[PDB]
Ligand binder design. Sequence first.
Ligand SMILES: [Zn+2]
Length: 334
Amino acid sequence: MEWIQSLPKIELHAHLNGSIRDSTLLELARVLGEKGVIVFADVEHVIQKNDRSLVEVFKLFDLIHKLTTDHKTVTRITREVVEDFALENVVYLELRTTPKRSDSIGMSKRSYMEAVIQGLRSVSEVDIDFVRKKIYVRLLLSIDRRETTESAMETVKLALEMRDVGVVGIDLSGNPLVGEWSTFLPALQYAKDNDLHITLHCGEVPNPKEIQAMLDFKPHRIGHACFFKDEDWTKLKSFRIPVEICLTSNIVTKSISSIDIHHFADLYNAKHPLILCTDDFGVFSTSLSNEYALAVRSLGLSKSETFALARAAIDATFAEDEVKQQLRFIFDSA
Ligand SMILES: [Zn+2]
């Protein structure tokens, strides 16, 4: 019910371009149709009933990226996403995004990320700390599974350069059927050796060797873990790696057949760290409050158990100890 919306919450797995307001996406589509760069009726037709199954949803992401890969838009959607999360009482957000290169518009991975920073500086409806509601924001740079080792290294280099504006870690994301772990391991190792924190999209499709190789790398977090086998769970629980749980995402993409069999319940009962996350609240028509409502109903949690779960996410953040202490005070005040 309504008490979940006012619960202080921590979001650790939200993609910038998957978190866009419906109205904003349509406004961008409309402006580009008036320009004739797209046809509004087609782009609206994919937006409406793309299946968002695992295979289908990446075509929607391709389409979104045609609408949003521009400096002004990146700045706008960064502000809108932070404000949307803060207004449902997210008090700490790790926002992840894949820096993009587009030569025709003078966009580099660095200038893309500068537009994100400009968006954070434009936040006005709420108070923000990124290095009246208040939200702490920190940044993850995503490496996409289509990239090369050299390209991944450029992203890691950028992340190190931008630690002064709140970049705290690196993610590996994108189509789980594309690319090989061997391509990304060297760049992720460089990141980890430079004290960046690492989260990995892991087990979105069956892939026993890659799941084991990702676990053996000992990232600080993983996302999803939908197609783990018993040896994978054993290693995960022994390494104590927190899992970013994306309930609606997993169910809509058909990575998990039902919330009633979703592994988040086993993790909860095994006292393994988990954090409820939105993944793409725009694409999947959800919110972090609604993800908690799904979990509270399915597990049968009391208010007190829900508050305890939400608070446990503090020690899984990639934030400095000072920020974690402030989060503890915020939670202990609620
Ligand atoms: Zn994701």
